[PDB]
Amino acid sequence: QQAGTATAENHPPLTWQECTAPGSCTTQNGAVVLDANWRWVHDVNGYTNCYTGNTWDPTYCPDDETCAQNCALDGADYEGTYGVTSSGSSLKLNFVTGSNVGSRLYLLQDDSTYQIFKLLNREFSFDVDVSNLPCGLNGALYFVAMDADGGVSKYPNNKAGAKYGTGYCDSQCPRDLKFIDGEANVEGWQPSSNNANTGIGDHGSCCAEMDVWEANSISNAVTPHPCDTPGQTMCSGDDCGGTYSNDRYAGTCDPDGCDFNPYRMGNTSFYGPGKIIDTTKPFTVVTQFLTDDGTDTGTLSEIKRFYIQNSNVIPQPNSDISGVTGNSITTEFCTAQKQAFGDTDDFSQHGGLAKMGAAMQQGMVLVMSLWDDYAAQMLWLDSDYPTDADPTTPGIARGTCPTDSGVPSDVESQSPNSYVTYSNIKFGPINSTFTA
Ligand SMILES: OC[C@H]1O[C@@H](O[C@H]2[C@H](O)[C@@H](O)[C@H](O[C@H]3[C@H](O)[C@@H](O)[C@H](O[C@H]4[C@H](O)[C@@H](O)[C@H](O[C@H]5[C@H](O)[C@@H](O)[C@H](O)O[C@@H]5CO)O[C@@H]4CO)O[C@@H]3CO)O[C@@H]2CO)[C@H](O)[C@@H](O)[C@@H]1O
Ligand SMILES: *[C@@H]1O[C@H](CO)[C@@H](O[C@@H]2O[C@H](CO)[C@@H](O[C@@H]3O[C@H](CO)[C@@H](O)[C@H](O)[C@@H]3O)[C@H](O)[C@H]2NC(C)=O)[C@H](O)[C@H]1NC(C)=O
Ligand SMILES: OC[C@H]1O[C@@H](O[C@H]2[C@H](O)[C@@H](O)[C@H](O[C@H]3[C@H](O)[C@@H](O)[C@H](O)O[C@@H]3CO)O[C@@H]2CO)[C@H](O)[C@@H](O)[C@@H]1O
Ligand SMILES: *[C@@H]1O[C@H](CO)[C@@H](O[C@@H]2O[C@H](CO)[C@@H](O)[C@H](O)[C@H]2NC(C)=O)[C@H](O)[C@H]1NC(C)=O
């Protein structure tokens, strides 16, 4: 994709902190950028769309390469079109703005380069307000093994780069992306039946993903997802696997992950409105990525979670699922959880924590997003899933929402002013970001 000139691009600023020890932190002046899929794509020599609704225009896009040469990604009116604002260390993502639904943003080191985090033997903390996230919505904060430059050094026909939010990948090997590896996704494009703005092409973009936070006011989950190749790679067709291929398990990435959602793990009292972590008010989420020998070069061995609300430091609750002990993600936990729930252990198949840690070694980009779910209505996060199962069977119930909830047309109409706000990001050594 070319860099368009019709709408100006300016990245909202966002501060965050690096800490060396508890109470000893310094401020980084970051910024965020909107993902390429949200942008106008048009003729590089004019203003005619290359893509409208969910249709490519063959005049500009007779094939993937020509399309990328002929078409430009343009700038974003962050507040007015996309409902994205920032102030100091706070980033607020509104749900519906006009016809736009949510957003996906990346943290920048500079105007052409994503910030890279090396998570091994480190701790990441942030504050969040999920109070205005009802059933069916997901405010996500997570890491993916994207290239820092958005692909530009590898793919000459990508001139837009990180400045325009190119290069996304995740453990679903998403095929909905309009540009992957300097090519458009026109040649095998199939418009979505239920989303007027989207489709699925032959190309997908795979990489490992550490889902630190997927949540609404009902439920949350923390979920690593390994891939066979840790960093960004292209896949083709149904061999991509992931949510939108014929078979989610056909590819090189684990689409399910090894998840810890306290409600799903048998403690419904812990997280939600008025609960131990009371989602009607903001709180702090701390996540630690521990290694087997406690050093920067050890193998990822344990992912731990603490919450802070009203100055009370509260560990993740223990699992109350038979056979599955503790409050953290480890190989033992993941093996046990898949067995107890009767779920396929695709996590182990794609290298588990060892491959997650390999991705962490490559460096990962911070993503903050807000979305609703055309495939599964977020039922996997906040309801009973699958819907044919007995909600009393361990693993089925993940939150309080009914199985009719979360249909995009319903929640976009009923809760347009929903939002998620992330703030006070802190990163550093274990125990450096909070009062252990
Ligand atoms: O007026 C300006 C300009 O508009 C152009 O039209 C734009 C329009 O402005 C945008 O609102 C619209 O944005 C949608 C994108 O087309 C669409 O691809 C994107 O799809 C999302 C999907 O809705 C969402 O569920 C999905 O969520 C992912 C999360 O982000 C991740 O965190 C999680 O891990 O995984 C989930 C599921 O995959 O992400 C996809 C994107 O990958 O939704 C956008 C918001 O509604 O784009 C239009 C262009 O297509 C118009 O063309 C111009 O003429 C005009 O100037
Ligand atoms: C759901 O999860 C919550 C949070 O983990 C559980 O509450 C916690 O239960 C533990 C074990 O009983 C409590 O720990 C104990 O505290 C007492 C008194 O301070 C101390 O004597 C013991 O040595 C132990 O440390 C803990 O206080 C409590 N945490 C909170 C924040 O309330 C709860 O039991 C779980 N509910 C269900 C139904 O499983
Ligand atoms: O964000 C990427 C896509 O996510 C899809 O949600 C999936 C979750 O990311 C994944 O962790 C969850 O895995 C389930 C699994 O499907 C189920 O069989 C097992 O019992 O529990 C796992 C943990 O909840 O799967 C869901 C659904 O595929 C979104 O549906 C999709 O829109 C989005 O692009
Ligand atoms: C981070 O702080 C925690 C909590 O103070 C430390 O964990 C404690 O470690 C001691 C042994 O060194 C144990 O007796 C306690 O039971 C632990 N508490 C908890 C909550 O786990 C931990 O060692 C610190 N990490 C580092 C790298 O210093």
The amino acid that residue 319 corresponds to is S
By DSSP bridging, strand 283-291 and strand 100-101 are unpaired
Query: In this structure, are residues 178 and 36 in contact, taking their beta carbons and an 8 Å threshold?
Result: yes
Q: Which residue has the tokens 């965050």?
A: 16
Task: Provide the sign of the torsion angle of the four alpha carbons 335, 243, 170, 379, taken in this order.
Answer: negative
Instruction: Using CB atoms within 10 Å of the CB of residue 90, give its burial: 0 to 12 exposed, 13 to 18 middle, 19+ buried.
Output: middle
Please report which ligand is nearest the Cα atom of 123.
4
Closest C-alpha among 321, 222, 219 to residue 270: 219
What span, in angstroms and rounded, lies between the C-alpha atoms of 113 and 107?
A: 9
Helix (H) or strand (E) holding 190: strand 190-191
Separation of alpha carbons 57 and 363, rounded Å: 37
Q: How far is CA 129 from CA 205, 217, 303, 311, 429, in A?
A: 30, 9, 23, 16, 25
Q: Which two tokens stand for residue 248?
A: 């989610």
248 CA closest ligand 3 atom index:
28
Q: What totals of helices (H) and strands (E) does the chain contain, helices first?
A: 7, 31
> Residue 283: beta bridge partners?
128
Closest ligand (CA of 39): 1
> Would you state the structure tokens that stand for residue 218, as one six-digit string?
């009902």
Q: Is 426 in the pocket of ligand 1 (CB under 6 A)?
A: no
Q: Which of 380, 390, 396 to mutate to test the pocket of ligand 3 (most atoms within 8 A of CB)?
A: 380
In total, the chain counts a number of residues equal to 436
Q: What is the secondary structure of 136-164 as a DSSP string?
A: T-EEEEEEE---TTTTTTT-TT--SGGGG
- DSSP category for residue 328: S
Concatenating the DSSP letter of every residue in 57-120 gives: -TTT-SSHHHHHHHEEE----HHHHH-EEEETTEEEEESEETTEE-EEEEEEEETTEEPEE--T
What is the distance between the alpha carbons of residues 93 and 84, in angstroms, rounded to a whole number?
5
Name the nearest CA neighbour of 37 among 49, 48, 24, 51: 51
**Does residue 319 have its Cβ closer than 6 Å to ligand 2?**
no
Q: Rounded to an integer, what distance in angstroms lies between the CA atom of residue 174 and that of residue 170?
A: 7
Residue with tokens 């920048």: 108
The DSSP bridge partners found for residue 419 are 94
Quote the DSSP letter at residue 133.
-
Catalytic one of 9, 183, 214, 412: 214
Whole-angstrom distance, CA of residue 97 vs CA of residue 150: 27
**Which DSSP symbol is given to 337?**
H
Cis peptide before 386 (omega within 30 of 0): yes
CB-CB contact of 401 with 347 (8 Å) = no
112: closest CA among 183, 167, 171, 71?
A: 167
In terms of Cα–Cα distance, which of 172, 186, 187 is closest to 140? 172
Residue 209 annotated in active site: yes
> At how many Å resolution was this determined?
1.2
Residue in the block written with tokens 């325009």 = 164
Cβ distance 179 to 408 under 8 Å?
no
β-pairing, 419-429 vs 183-184, is unpaired
Is the shortest distance between the CB of 430 and ligand 4 below 6 Å? yes
Helices within 164-205 (DSSP H only): none
Please provide residue 300's backbone torsions phi and psi, each rounded to the nearest 5 degrees: -50, 125
The CA-based dihedral angle spanning residues 410, 368, 197, 42, taken in that order and rounded to the nearest 10 degrees: 150
Report residue 267 as tokens: 């403690």
Crossing angle of helices 352-362 and 331-341, rounded to 10°: 130
Atom nearest to 431 CA in ligand 4: 1
CB of 146 shorter than 6 A to ligand 1: no
Q: Report the alpha-carbon distance of residue 270 to residue 17 in Å, rounded.
A: 28
DSSP-assigned letters across all residues of 259-324? -B-TTTTT-TTSEETTSSEETTS-EEEEEEEEETTSSTTSPEEEEEEEEEETTEEEEPPPP-BTTB
Kindly tell me the burial class for residue 22, based on how many C-beta atoms sit within 10 Å of its own C-beta (0-12, 13-18, 19 or more): middle
Dihedral (CA of 104, 8, 145, 172) sign:
positive
Closest ligand 3 atom, residue 172 Cα:
2
Beta-strand relationship, 419-429 and 13-21:
parallel
DSSP label at 374?
T
* Cβ-contact 379, 389 below 8 angstroms: no
Buried b (16+ CB within 10 A) or exposed e, 374-390: beebbbbbbbbbeeeee
Tokens 């039946």 identify what position? 193
Task: Please name every residue paired with 370 in a beta bridge, in sequence order, or none if there are none.
Answer: 103, 139
Per-residue CA distances from 293 to 121, 386, 403 (Å): 9, 39, 44
214 is catalytic: yes
Residue 1 is which amino acid?
Q
Residue labelled with tokens 């780069």: 161
User: How many angstroms is it from 34 CA to the middle of ligand 1?
Assistant: 10
Q: Please spell the DSSP secondary structure of 383-396, one letter per residue.
A: SBSSTTS-TTSTTT
Domains of the chain: 2-436 (2.70.100.10)
From 261, 268, 276, 325, give the residue whose CB has the most ligand 2 atoms within 8 Å, as the site to mutate: 276
Contact between residue 114 and residue 143 where contact means Cβ atoms under 8 Å apart:
no
